[PDB]
Structure formats: structure tokens, C-alpha cells
Amino acid sequence: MLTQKTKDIVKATAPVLAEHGYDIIKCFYQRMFEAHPELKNVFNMAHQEQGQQQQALARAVYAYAENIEDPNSLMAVLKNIANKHASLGVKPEQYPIVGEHLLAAIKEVLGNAATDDIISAWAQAYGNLADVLMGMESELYERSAEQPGGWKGWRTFVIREKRPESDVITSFILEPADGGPVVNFEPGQYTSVAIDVPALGLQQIRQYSLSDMPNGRSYRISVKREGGGPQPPGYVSNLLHDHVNVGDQVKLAAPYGSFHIDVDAKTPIVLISGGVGLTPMVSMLKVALQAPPRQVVFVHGARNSAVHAMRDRLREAAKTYENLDLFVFYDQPLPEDVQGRDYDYPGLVDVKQIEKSILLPDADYYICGPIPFMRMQHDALKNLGIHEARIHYEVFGPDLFAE
Numbered sequence: 001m002l003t004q005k006t007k008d009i010v011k012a013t014a015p016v017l018a019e020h021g022y023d024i025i026k027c028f029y030q031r032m033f034e035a036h037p038e039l040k041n042v043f044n045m046a047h048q049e050q051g052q053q054q055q056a057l058a059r060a061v062y063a064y065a066e067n068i069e070d071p072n073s074l075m076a077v078l079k080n081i082a083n084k085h086a087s088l089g090v091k092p093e094q095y096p097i098v099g100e101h102l103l104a105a106i107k108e109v110l111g112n113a114a115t116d117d118i119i120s121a122w123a124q125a126y127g128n129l130a131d132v133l134m135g136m137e138s139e140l141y142e143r144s145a146e147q148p149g150g151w152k153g154w155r156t157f158v159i160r161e162k163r164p165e166s167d168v169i170t171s172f173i174l175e176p177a178d179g180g181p182v183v184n185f186e187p188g189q190y191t192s193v194a195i196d197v198p199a200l201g202l203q204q205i206r207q208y209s210l211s212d213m214p215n216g217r218s219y220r221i222s223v224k225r226e227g228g229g230p231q232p233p234g235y236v237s238n239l240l241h242d243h244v245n246v247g248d249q250v251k252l253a254a255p256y257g258s259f260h261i262d263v264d265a266k267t268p269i270v271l272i273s274g275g276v277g278l279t280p281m282v283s284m285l286k287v288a289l290q291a292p293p294r295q296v297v298f299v300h301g302a303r304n305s306a307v308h309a310m311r312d313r314l315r316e317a318a319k320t321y322e323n324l325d326l327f328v329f330y331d332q333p334l335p336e337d338v339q340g341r342d343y344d345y346p347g348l349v350d351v352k353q354i355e356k357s358i359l360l361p362d363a364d365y366y367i368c369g370p371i372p373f374m375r376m377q378h379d380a381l382k383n384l385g386i387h388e389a390r391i392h393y394e395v396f397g398p399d400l401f402a403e
């Protein structure tokens with residue numbers, strides 16, 4: 001537990017760590033993987049190769065230092081991290097490993113600036129946080145294990161169905177190879193696919209939102225091909241698209257995540273998604289639609305019809321259910337796409353254009369999609385006067401972003 005003096009050093013030195021983030025990250029991974037190559041099966045080996053994490057790291061040390069006197073705010077984001085670590089299968093015995101290399105890295109990068117006081121302070125902060133996280137991750141592991149259909153670590157699943165949803169998004173329906181029940185989850189939650197990457201000669205792990213409702217038998221994920229156009233292709237998403245088929249096997253983690261609807265609630269929901277960001281919205285849609293009433297506004301932005309996933313299914317849903325409003329935005333509509341017919345509005349999702357349809361009293365708003373899309377939606381919702389507490393978001397990447 002941290003003395004006042006220790007927290008003050010953290011507050012005074014976080015900028016130094018954030019400034020040297022690139023070199024630290026680079027040194028940390030060089031050291032850790034030399035000591036423990038096997039850890040390369042748990043981390044992302046694309047990472048580009050570390051840029052996104054430097055951003056994450058810079059934001060994370062600042063926010064930590066900015067909230068070190070407020071344990072409640074700190075507990076909340078720790079929960080999101082525990083959930084992500086639980087999904088990856090992070091183990092208490094790995095905490096001393098990360099710690100040594102992180103500290104050895106920080107020390108080697110700061111060199112002369114790495115005083116005893118400073119190294120002592122971040123080392124205590126590493127330990128304080130390690131403790132909290134391990135306890136949270138353990139409690140999450142036990143809760144999955146004990147529930148009907150639950151498990152710890154990886155369970156083998158077989159692909160039963162593989163269906164294209166658009167040019168770029170394909171669904172996979174998964175049943176356990178053992179043939180038993182699967183655990184319940186909250187709409188909005190994710191699994192993690194663990195699979196061997198031939199090009200890498202390594203296992204890689206990626207999160208995917210569970211895109212259908214709980215049924216007790218199977219899970220659905222819906223995967224966007226992260227393809228070419230100067231940028232290198234994604235590892236796992238291309239692998240699922242081209243090389244995984246009906247009858248092949250993957251490993252899955254139990255459902256985790258802190259982004260979801262309260263199923264027992266009867267208050268309304270506004271579901272705002274961009275592109276593949278729709279995947280957890282569909283699960284929330286399908287659940288909320290049973291039980292009086294409940295009231296769902298499904299607001300989706302896509303490029304056009306070619307890349308619009310689940311297009312015919314949502315359209316049919318909007319004419320079968322009185323409690324569902326559908327609003328579709330097309331950013332660059334194809335010539336065969338016609339407004340007032342195949343989509344509602346052109347351009348980006350803009351909540352002002354449907355303001356009275358979305359501002360249901362004491363609603364909950366849920367946002368998923370690319371970061372600038374989420375800032376944009378968050379901002380717009382906040383200019384209508386919705387309380388920060390009523391806006392919920394999930395990042396398809398590290399972070400900690402639109403915090």
C-alpha cells in the first residue's frame with residue numbers, strides 16, 4: 001500500500017515514463033521474450049510492432065497518476081483490465097515476470113534519471129496493482145468455472161456454420177467438441193479465439209464479441225477481414241476467413257468483458273455502431289427484444305450495402321417489432337444503394353438527424369466502432385445532455401481511449 005510520498009513520486013514522474021514509452025516498451029519486450037520466449041504465444045506479435053501500445057501506455061500512466069488519490073475510479077478501469085487478462089488466460093505466476101522486465105526496462109531506459117526513489121515508487125505501484133488484478137482475475141476464473149457450461153483456460157470448439165455477412169465480415173457458429181452446454185453471458189461480452197499462426201510459428205489470441213444471444217448450446221462470432229491496401233494483412237482475421245472451415249477446431253476463452261446491457265433492466269437502449277462494431281449490438285438487440293417492451297434504437301453506420309453486415313435481418317426485424325427503430329447511415333453509398341429505401345441517411349452517423357428518436361427518457365446508450373467514430377458519438381450524445389454515466393463503450397483494441 002502506497003505512502004503519500006510514494007504517490008507523489010508517481011505523480012511527479014509519470015510524464016518521464018510516458019515520454020520514454022517507446023524505448024521502454026521496446027526494451028521490456030526484448031528482455032521478457034529472451035527470458036521467456038513462451039510468452040510470445042500470449043501477446044500480439046503484429047502490434048505494428050509496438051506503436052499502439054506506446055499510445056496506450058502514455059495515456060495509462062497519466063490517468064493512473066491523475067487518479068492515484070481516487071481508489072474508486074481506479075477500481076473501475078482495473079475491472080476492465082482484469083476482464084481482458086482473464087480472457088487471455090493471464091496467470092498469477094506471470095506477475096513477477098512482467099514486473100522484473102518492466103522495472104529492468106524502465107531502469108535501463110531512464111539510466112541516470114532512474115533514481116532509487118523513482119524505481120522504488122513504480123515498483124510498489126506495480127506490486128499494488130498486481131495484487132488487485134490477480135485477486136480480480138482469480139474471482140472471475142472461479143465464477144466462470146462454477147457456472148453451468150463454464151470452464152477455465154481454453155475449451156475446444158468446432159465450427160458448425162461459416163456464413164458470409166457481407167464482402168468483409170463472416171460469421172462462425174461454434175459448438176464445443178465435447179458436446180456439452182456452454183456458459184451464459186451478458187449481451188455485449190466477448191470470447192477470445194486462440195489459434196496457431198503458421199506464418200509466425202506461434203499461437204495468437206484475439207477477442208471477438210459474441211454476436212448472438214445466449215442459447216446454452218453455441219456461440220457466434222462475426223469477423224471482419226483486416227485486409228490489404230498498403231497496410232499488411234491481419235494475422236488471425238485472414239486466417240479465419242481463408243483457412244478455417246466447417247469442421248475445424250479453435251480454442252475459446254469463457255465470456256468476459258464489462259461492456260454489456262443490464263438484462264433485468266426495463267429502461268430503453270440506444271445501440272450506436274460503426275462497421276464491425278455492430279457485432280455486440282446484435283446480441284443486445286436480440287435479447288432486449290423479448291420482454292416488455294423493451295425499446296431498442298439500432299443506429300448503424302456502414303460504407304454501403306456491400307460492406308453492411310446482417311442487412312436483410314435487421315430490416316426484417318424493424319418491420320416485425322414495434323419496439324425497434326432502425327436507422328442506417330451509408331458513408332459512401334454505391335450507385336444501386338438508394339436513400340429512403342436501402343438506407344435512411346447519407347454520411348456518418350449523426351445523432352442530431354434522429355434526435356427525438358434517440359433521446360428516450362433515462363435511456364442507456366451503447367457505442368462501438370473505430371475510435372474517432374466513438375469520440376464523435378460520445379461528443380454528440382454529451383451535447384444533447386446525456387449523463388456521462390449513461391454512455392457505455394467498447395474498444396476493439398487496447399484502451400483506455402475515449403475515457
Ligand SMILES: Cc1cc2nc3c(=O)[nH]c(=O)nc-3n(C[C@H](O)[C@H](O)[C@H](O)COP(=O)(O)OP(=O)(O)OC[C@H]3O[C@@H](n4cnc5c(N)ncnc54)[C@H](O)[C@@H]3O)c2cc1C
Nearest residue numbers: 046206207208209223224226232234235236237279396397
Ligand atoms: C473487446 C474486443 C472485441 C472485438 N470484437 C470484434 C468483432 O466482433 N469482430 C471483429 O472482426 N473484430 C473484433 N475485435 C478485433 C479483433 O480482436 C482483432 O484485433 C482483429 O480481428 C484483427 O486481428 P488480426 O490478427 O487479424 O490483426 P493483427 O495481425 O493483430 O494486426 C492488427 C491490425 O494492424 C494492421 N497491421 C499489421 N501490421 C502492420 C504494420 N506493421 N504496419 C501498419 N499496420 C499493420 C493489420 O492489417 C490489422 O488491421 C475485437 C477486439 C476487442 C479488443
Ligand code: HEM
Nearest residue numbers: 042043044081084088090094095098126129130397398399
Ligand atoms: C500490474 C501488472 C499489469 C498491469 C497494470 C497490466 C495492465 C494492462 C493494461 C492496461 C492492458 C491493456 C488492456 C486492454 O487492452 O484492454 C493490459 C493488457 C495485456 N496484459 Fe497486462 N497488465 C499487467 C500484467 C500482465 C501480466 C502479468 C501478463 C501476463 C502475460 C499480462 C499480459 C497482458 C496481455 C497479453 C495484454 C493484451 C495486450 C496485447 O494485445 O498484447 N499483463 N495489461
Ligand SMILES: Clc1ccc(CO[C@@H](Cn2ccnc2)c2ccc(Cl)cc2Cl)cc1
Nearest residue numbers: 017021024025028053056057098102106398
Ligand atoms: Cl514504461 C511502462 C510503465 C508501465 C507499464 C504498465 O503496463 C505495461 C506492462 N504490461 C504489458 C501487458 N500487460 C502489462 C503495459 C500495459 C499496457 C500496454 Cl497496452 C503496454 C504495456 Cl508495456 C508498462 C510500461
